[model samples]
Structure formats: C-alpha cells, structure tokens
Target: GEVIVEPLIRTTISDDRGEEPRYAGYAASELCSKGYGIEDVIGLLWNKKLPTREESEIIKRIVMISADHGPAVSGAFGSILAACAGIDMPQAVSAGMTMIGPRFGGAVTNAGKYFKMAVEDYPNDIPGFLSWMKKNVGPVPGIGHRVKSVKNPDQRVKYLVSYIKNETSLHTPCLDYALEVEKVTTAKKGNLILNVDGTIGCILMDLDFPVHSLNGFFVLARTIGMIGHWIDQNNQNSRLIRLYDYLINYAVKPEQEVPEKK
Candidate 1:
C-alpha cells in the first residue's frame, strides 16, 4: 500500500517558483532592496511587523547573552562527548540539541505561560499564586537557579531586567509578576531566585512573543555554545569520554548464582 500525506502547515513565509523566491509577501529582490537584517526576518516570521531599533537591540542582547552558558551544562557536555566519540559536527551538535527538553533548557515556555496566568488571575495575591503552583506544579518553573542565589545573583537576569525597565517602554505584566514571585520565593529560600530562564521567558512574554516560541530562544542561543564545544573538542583531538570507576556507583545482586539452570 502507498500513502500520501498532506502538509499540516501552509506557510506564507516563503515560496519558490521558477526564478524567484518570496518571503513574507516580499520577493527576494525586494528584501535585498529593503536591507532587512536576520533580526527583521525573525520578527517578520513571528509577527507580521518589522522590529524597531530598540526592539532589534533588545533581541540582539537576548541572543548575545543567551548564546553560551558553559561547558559544564548538559547541552555543552553532551556535544563535547559526541565530539570526543568521533561523531560528525551536525550529529554531535544534534546530540546536544536533543538534551533541551523540559528539564535542562526548555522550561522557559511553561515559565512564561504560568507567569502570564498568575499575572492575569492572581495579580494581587502572589502568595495564592505560589501556593497553587506548589500544589499543582510542584516548583514554579522560573524561580530557582542551581548555582546563583541572593548573595550570588544571576547578573544576566539582573542586566536584562534593568535594560527592559530603564531602556524600553514595554509593558511587562508577566515579568513584573515573576519578579514579585521571585521576592516571595527568595524570602522562603535564598537560592530560589529568578534565573536566566525565568528572566528571558518573562521578557519574551513582555515583547508579545507567543508562548511556544519562548524555549526556542534558549535552544537557538545554546546551539552556538554546543557547536563551540564540539569545535573545541575536535580541535584538541580529545579522546572518548569514559566515566572512571570511582565516578560511578555500582549496585547489584551477589555473584556466584548461576547453578540453577536445571
């Protein structure tokens, strides 16, 4: 038997015919004529409007700040291991990309979503919102970081917040709510401060971006870091990564139990 599948999405973003390609209603020639940058292309794809200079600057700051974390993070480490194992660049990079699910680097979407919900529903009662979050979702998505704390704050989050507040006139109810929640969470636990994920999520929400695209920011930015790790490992001709025996804990049944085959 043979099967035919129809594309679920019909895109107005682009199409090619004969000698020319159209993107978001503009021909390639026209786009070149307009001198739109990649940031404009992204904005056009997200929403049917071009980004202003300030908005473009904000986007560039986001991309720049999020472009790398460190080699210790899961995505970078995965890519490093793949490179050490002699995998090609794309596959090694993909090995890192595969790690950006709900836990590691993809929690920003839900962080933005829940913060938006709280901003709309429990604007005056942060405690109530936090209680519901604790009961229903365990931990709030964007509140806590693994390393940075009240004494050791995340400078990236701080910088983004300052920039958004002082530089732009964008209204950010979600970001505001997250900050309030951060205050509550930090009051309870000092280290439960707003991390970079939470900061970016709230900012993106303030920028009127769609919820589903929130995590894509992290994934896109982290790809640069992942590729960097891959290239560094390949450059040094690193050996395959093997966990030392001391680094692993082995638990098993007793040995010498193979005499009961009859």
Candidate 2:
C-alpha cells in the first residue's frame, strides 16, 4: 500500500539495557545543550535533524498555547486532580497524560489534514471548510470549544502572520498552508485552521519535520503545564485522583441465600 509509515515520537522508552528512560540517544536531563529546543529534538527523533531557530519559535508558541486546562468542566478531571494531588510534580504530571489518549491526540493532525484539504477544495474561503464539515461530519473538529460559542476562542488565527516570506496573507499558517494545498489539488472538506495543536503541526511540516514530531512536542509542552498543576495540588494536600464513583447495582449478591447456610 503506498502508505507512508512514520515513527511515533518516542520521548520516553526503555533502552537496550532497560535501565532507564531515554530520548533518542541522550538522557532527558541532557535536553538543554542538545542544540535542539523541544521542537528540534522532536524533529530529530522523527526526521533526523535539528530544527533551525525560526522553526523552534513556531513550535514554542504553539506549545505554550495548547498545553493546559478545559477538562474538569467536561467531566474529565486529569489536570484538576493533578493540581490536587500531594505528590512530587512528576508523578502528578504523568498521571494527567495517562487520562488522555489518541482520539484527543489525533485532533491536531486532523486539523493539519483539514487545512491541507481546504486548500484543495476551497482555496479562498477557508472558513467554508468549516461549513462543509458541519454538513457532512456532524461537527467541526477544531473551531468550537465546549466553553466558547458564537466565535472560536482561537479564531484570531485568521489574521496571524505568514511564515513563508512574501506570502502576504493574514490567515493563520494552518489556513494558509491548507489553502495553498487547496489551490493546487482538489479534495473533500476537512479542517482548515490550526487549533493550538494543528498550528504546531503545520509549523513542523513547513520546516520539513516528520509528523511524529507532534507527539514529542506535546509531551514537552504538557510537562511545563503539568508542573503548574502539580504545584497547586501539592499546596492543597490533595489525594490520589480517583474517579467520581458512579453507582449502578449490576450484580445481585445472593441476599436470600442465608437460609441455605442455616
């Protein structure tokens, strides 16, 4: 199948000796002088090269923007409890990601693909991709937030600066790239703007980064945000993050069996 297979950004893994976790060849502590920001390290892990300064900044901004909040309100409380737990930062922090998985993780890429597809299907009205998506898919992926209605919280991306020089357009880079791709090829409706995640993705893509870089960037970004929650949890003396104990009597233990024993 001519499908392109790429590695997942493997930031933490056991080595040959199974001694401890490592990123690529260096220890996590060695992250500072690797001449790679979180983005370059992620890029190298997947694509085998350090990203340049400009490339790093794109990823940094995206990371800073995308890494925290909005889950306690959704009946999911990973970050919230992390803030509550009275533990070392790392334990509480790692606990947070354990709650989130690929469905949430894949949205950024879907956003990337959306932008790419929009350029293929609707070159000018990038927002039209949003409308088409609402028609066919039942919901737009990256635009609306559970908390914000009437407009997207991040919709300000519509007028952000372009990365490629002389590409005088105010549309967010995600929209720009998607539109550029749209102008060249034809495709069906999809995401045409960058949620914080997708914005990072398109930035990496333009830098010729491998797709897996997104996962590594996510870990790096979340670590920073998670640390904050851990601090809060520690201060409040929180306990282990347990789920809200939902009750439903599914199993009937034999209440009438006492007579048989007698």
Candidate 2 lDDT over 1-262, as tens digits, reads: 6989898775442244545445555554566755556665665566655556765666566676666655452112565565565545666666776754466455555665555566568766656776787787655444434443233434534423344333422235554564454332223333333344545555545555445555655666666666666666666677676656475545866666455554
Evaluated with lDDT, which candidate comes out highest?
A: 1
lDDT of each: 0.84, 0.54
Candidate 2, residue 75: how far the Cα is off, in Å? 12
On residues 1-262, what C-alpha lDDT tens digit does candidate 1 reach at each position?
A: 8989989888766678736876666565666678766666667666656778778777878888988889998899999999999999999999999989888876678888899999888989998998898899999988887788999999888898898889988778998988888888999999999988888888888888888877777887889899999999989999999989997777867787578777
TM-score of each: 0.87, 0.56
Q: Best TM-score goes to which candidate?
A: 1
- Span of 10 residues, lowest total lDDT, candidate 1: 18-27
Model 2 residue 84 CA deviation in Å: 4.9
lDDT of 1 at 1: 88
